[PDB]
């Protein structure tokens, strides 16, 4: 990194005179693809002699299936405990009056069959999600020799997640609406309404700066926030390394 000597003296302090409202995007895996394995179809494909010989390993195969079932249930549990923190599905108010803050890109688009926001659309388009397949195509056009068809013909199935991506989007939208319409109060019991400017004033008082500086610079802050969102809207739209 850069060499940067910092001035130090027993009677010299540096005070900020301005600020920037940064927006940082960070990603966390939550679940992985649930999978199931058929011992009989994998080891002894469809021969009866080999299955009869395999019958004495039923303990091993029961153990394997139990482990994979535990993994699958664990994935469903992970998704539920991450997204279903609140069981009150709040909906955003029809009017957008948040003291100049623009939440267009992080709220559901009503003009799409799925209820995702713009940033969500970019995120889902930035990942391939290749394991999706309909059985019958493998029974039909197999000259292409897809890998998924081989996996299915050898008993290695991929189970679908319990929560559809639309449902996860609904949970996320509920969390966003509660966040911007009630602050932290909806997490600690019922959701208590508050204007967004007063909410961000509470946050500013939280970080250790008086709330007045917000109201004296509210518009500026809003613009900064919007600008930061714009950066995200392009940072996730060009590269795929995020």
């Amino acid at each position: 990194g850069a060499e940067n000597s910092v001035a130090y003296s027993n009677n010299s302090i540096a005070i900020p005179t301005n600020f920037t409202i940064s927006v940082t995007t960070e990603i966390l895996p939550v679940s992985m693809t649930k999978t199931s394995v058929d011992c009989t179809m994998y080891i002894c494909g469809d021969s009866t002699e080999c299955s009869n010989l395999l019958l004495q390993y039923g303990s091993f195969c029961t153990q394997l299936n139990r482990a994979l079932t535990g993994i699958a249930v664990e994935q469903d549990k992970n998704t539920q405990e991450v997204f279903a923190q609140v069981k009150q599905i709040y909906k955003t108010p029809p009017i957008k009056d948040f003291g100049g803050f623009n939440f267009s890109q992080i709220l559901p688009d009503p003009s799409k069959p799925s209820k995702r926001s713009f940033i969500e659309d970019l995120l889902f388009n930035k990942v391939t999600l290749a394991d999706i397949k309909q059985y019958g195509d493998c029974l039909g056009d197999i000259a292409a020799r897809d890998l998924i068809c081989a996996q299915k013909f050898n008993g290695l199935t991929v189970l679908p997640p319990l929560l559809t991506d639309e449902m996860i989007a609904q949970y996320t939208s509920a969390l966003l609406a509660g966040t911007i319409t009630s602050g932290w109060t909806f997490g600690a019991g019922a959701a208590l309404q508050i204007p967004f400017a007063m909410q961000m004033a509470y946050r500013f008082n939280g970080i250790g700066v008086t709330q007045n500086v917000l109201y004296e610079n509210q518009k500026l802050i809003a613009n900064q926030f919007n600008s930061a969102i714009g950066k995200i809207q392009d940072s996730l739209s060009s590269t795929a390394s995020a």
Binding site: S36, T40, T48, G58, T62, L159
Partner: peptide, 18 residues
């Protein structure tokens, strides 16, 4: 490998066709 199954959904192997 049991005579009692609790409530749930189970992946089952391939013994049905012969």
């Amino acid at each position: 490998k049991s005579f009692t199954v609790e409530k749930g959904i189970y992946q089952t192997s391939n013994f049905r066709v012969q």
